[PDB]
Design a protein around this ligand. Sequence first.
Ligand SMILES: Nc1ncnc2c1ncn2[C@@H]1O[C@H](COP(=O)(O)OP(=O)(O)OC[C@H]2O[C@@H](O)[C@H](O)[C@@H]2O)[C@@H](O)[C@H]1O
Length: 166
Amino acid sequence: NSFSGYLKLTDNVYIKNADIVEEAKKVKPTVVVNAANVYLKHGGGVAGALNKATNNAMQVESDDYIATNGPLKVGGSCVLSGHNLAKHCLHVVGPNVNKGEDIQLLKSAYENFNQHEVLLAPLLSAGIFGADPIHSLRVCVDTVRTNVYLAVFDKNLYDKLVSSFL
Ligand SMILES: Nc1ncnc2c1ncn2[C@@H]1O[C@H](COP(=O)(O)OP(=O)(O)OC[C@H]2O[C@@H](O)[C@H](O)[C@@H]2O)[C@@H](O)[C@H]1O
């Protein structure tokens, strides 16, 4: 869990302009967080980048879990293997705002982080799921009590998040 180069936003939330995959390779964290959907079908954002970095081992494990146990709930999570990226991957489902799921469920989604002392994580629902990134960051800061290291890959977005936090 060696995090370096992060900006301190609050006493327990830190942020860095980086690819979450590269950070996981360099930090070797106990938990990396994936922004998932309820079927753990890993798509065009963080999820597909994590899965590719595991040479599809994440998708095979995910398909098996879902076939055996059923889909997650929006706002829910499950802990699976971190493969070569981390010890554990916490798959969390934020609301899909573009499809009319309730943005209030973003608070439930972030509450999952509180079961883990330290996490490398992305901003939930702020990419393919269409939530406002600044709002996602505020919900994270207000909800999460454990230590969270956020990795934001796009520089223009990182800059806009940091400044709105002045
Ligand atoms: N490699 C990356 N590293 C860091 N941040 C990234 C990366 N790729 C995207 N992001 C940023 O992570 C945040 C989350 O974006 P998404 O991964 O698209 O997550 P989400 O909005 O929750 O959508 C989830 C949906 O996308 C699919 O990948 C997934 O299977 C699910 O259906 C966004 O701010 C996005 O810009």
